[PDB]
């Protein structure tokens, strides 16, 4: 029964993955941090205890709780200890020692049946995950260890007469356990690591995970950049994520032009939005954006530059003449220094982001967004008018 039930999960696991290696099997059985977890359909009582098929299987790895002393010694030595991927990477990138101490779990893999994809089973499993480690599955009906072979038994057995048999079924716990039965471990966060694809990014964004890091090197096999997304549990402090999200957003915005210019503006916009959702998670106002000051405005842009912007809004200027202001304008708007005054549509933001941060030509935008060049110019000139009004009222 275990063999049959065992086969069924990898049938789900291997199908999602492209080219699986047998080594992962040894990882899953022997390594302690990994826990084996399955979503099943409702069990019909008339089926007589027959095992249902696995609809979704998720692979988690408990990571974190690293001794604070070990962090400096490894960080100073530049040596990465085996395992605990997310604590090491985040600590290295943000140089934060407290995060490594935090207890968390990495969703190593999620597998859903290809025929049933897009039906929401994966979202349901994660939504039930985040409840389990949050403690919402408490026991309501008013042990699971197995005795190990004793040294006495080993000493008393001779090689020739060894009766190696399957463990008695009575000793064995059940193959599947209800959540209320098994208490969870105390965790601070759920993290993932995956190549940034629109479907997957859309999938995890709906699951309230927020971005913390994106590798600048694309994976050679896939040509894709791995994105690290994180979700904090209720009842736990949430600040450190918010600071990380802001830094990643600033890091992402600036770095759009180097190597993510290949990314679609819609894809880039989603990443920025997902990060901004993290701010909305924080009801606290201690960490908030600062509105652009008049003095800072004067430093960034000269008066003639402001006159130049105004003329374009009035249409007395050519588009090329205003090419100077674009990257600063994109940074300040997406930096949110513009404030509540200035808001834009998703297409409008994508256009501004692309010229400002993906740095693409307006015609390049036209083909990408499937809009003729004139609308992009006209829709853009609308963008410049609103900020020019915003600058005017500030003055």
């Amino acid at each position: 029964v275990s063999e049959n039930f065992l086969e069924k999960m990898m049938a789900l696991y291997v199908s999602s993955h492209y080219k699986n290696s047998p080594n992962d099997l040894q990882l899953m059985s022997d390594a302690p941090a990994h826990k084996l977890f399955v979503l099943l359909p409702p069990i019909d009582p008339k089926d007589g205890g027959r095992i249902p098929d696995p609809l979704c299987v998720i692979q988690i790895a408990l990571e974190g709780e690293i001794s604070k002393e070990s962090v400096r010694n490894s960080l100073s030595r530049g040596q990465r200890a085996g395992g605990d991927l997310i604590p090491w990477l985040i600590s290295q990138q943000f140089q934060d020692e407290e995060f490594a101490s935090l207890s968390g779990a990495r969703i190593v893999r999620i597998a859903t049946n290809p025929e049933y994809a897009s039906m929401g089973y994966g979202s349901r499993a994660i939504e039930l995950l985040r409840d389990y480690f949050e403690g919402k599955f408490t026991d309501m009906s008013e042990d699971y260890s197995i005795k190990r072979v004793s040294d006495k038994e080993l000493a008393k057995t001779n090689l020739l007469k060894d009766d190696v048999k399957l463990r008695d079924a009575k000793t064995l716990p059940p193959l599947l356990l209800k959540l209320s039965e098994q208490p969870p471990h105390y965790l601070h966060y759920l993290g993932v690591s995956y190549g940034l694809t629109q479907s997957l990014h859309k999938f995890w964004k709906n699951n309230s995970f927020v971005p913390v890091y994106l590798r600048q090197t694309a994976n050679d096999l896939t040509g894709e950049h791995t994105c690290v997304m994180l979700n904090v549990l209720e009842g736990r402090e949430s600040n450190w994520l918010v600071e990380f999200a802001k830094d990643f957003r600033k890091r992402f915005l600036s770095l759009l032009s180097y190597d993510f210019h290949k990314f679609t503006a819609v894809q880039a916009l989603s990443v920025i939005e997902s990060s901004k959702k993290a701010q909305d998670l924080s009801d606290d106002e201690k960490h908030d954006n600062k509105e652009l000051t008049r003095t800072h405005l004067d430093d960034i842009f000269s008066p003639f530059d402001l006159k130049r912007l105004d003329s374009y809004s009035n249409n007395l200027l050519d588009y090329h003449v205003i090419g100077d202001m674009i990257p600063m304008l994109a940074l300040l708007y997406f930096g949110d220094k513009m404030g509540d005054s200035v808001k834009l549509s998703s297409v409008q933001s994508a256009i501004l982001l692309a010229i400002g941060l993906q740095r693409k030509n307006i015609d390049t935008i036209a083909k990408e967004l499937n809009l003729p060049s004139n609308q992009t110019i006209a829709m853009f000139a609308k963008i410049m008018r609103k900020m020019s009004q915003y600058f005017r009222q500030l003055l």
Partner: protein
């Protein structure tokens, strides 16, 4: 088979929940009594003067008054005993049955209330401990080892002084009958706006209303074509051509999804 136990407990929970809406209705109906009761006199002379205002009238209402409370509260002490018997709160089944059978007096009825409260107090300590341990274990707080609920009750019960002052607050501004006369005559030692004698549970009463309010919302002949002719209508013949690609999903997924339309230890 575990579905049967799960279903049965849900019924118990449901029966358990309905019981409150019935009792909360009892409290709601009693709300007019507590308001009117708070408006009553306070001192013996005021009662007599209230009696002297209309002597013969005040008598039968007082008798009609007194008779009902003995009937209400005696039935209630019977009403209380059977629960704590049935819900295992009281372990002495024989004593509870004896109390139910016998007819009790006002002073004796007070004694049962004290015992019923006291027995329920031990039940609180045992109950609140068990679930707090369970929830702590379920949430990983056991792994961590946010006060225990019983401890919170004990500590705030220790803060006993603060909570009268909340009760003594006269939010409704109730003035009991002949209050000014009692005040002038110095017949009210406690006083010598917060009134020690006026009881105000309005904030609590509203909360149960809101809670009951919130609960239910979530729960809540051949001619003219008049007969059918199947023959070929040539003008419409071959008006279009069928699309062989079919529906986007596979037939197996299709015929499946309609079926679900609208509804060694293995386990």
């Amino acid at each position: 088979q575990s579905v049967q136990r799960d279903a049965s407990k849900g019924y118990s929970i449901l029966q358990q929940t309905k019981l409150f809406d019935n009792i909360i209705d009892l409290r709601i109906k009693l709300q007019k009594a507590v308001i009117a009761a708070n408006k009553l006199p306070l001192t013996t002379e005021s009662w007599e003067e209230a009696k002297m205002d209309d002597s013969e009238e005040t008598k039968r209402l007082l008798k009609e008054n007194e008779k009902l409370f003995n009937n209400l509260f005696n039935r209630l002490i019977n009403f209380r005993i059977k629960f704590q018997l049935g819900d295992h709160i009281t372990q002495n089944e024989e004593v509870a049955k004896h109390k139910l059978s016998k007819k009790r007096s006002l002073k004796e009825l007070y004694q049962e209330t004290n015992s019923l409260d006291s027995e329920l107090k031990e039940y609180r300590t045992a109950v609140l401990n068990k679930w707090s341990t369970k929830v702590s274990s379920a949430s990983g707080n056991a792994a961590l080892s946010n006060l225990p609920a019983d401890v919170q009750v004990e500590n705030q019960l220790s803060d006993m002084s603060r909570l009268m002052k909340r009760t003594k607050l006269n939010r409704r501004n109730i003035t009991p009958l002949y209050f000014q006369k009692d005040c002038a005559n110095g017949r009210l030692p406690e006083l010598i706006t917060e009134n020690p004698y006026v009881f105000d549970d309005e904030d609590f009463y509203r909360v149960l209303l809101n809670d009951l309010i919130d609960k239910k919302i979530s729960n809540a002949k051949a001619s003219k074509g008049r007969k059918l002719n199947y023959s070929v209508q040539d003008p419409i013949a071959n008006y279009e051509a069928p699309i062989t690609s079919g529906y986007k999903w596979s037939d197996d997924q299709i015929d499946e999804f309609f079926a679900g339309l609208l509804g060694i230890q293995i386990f």
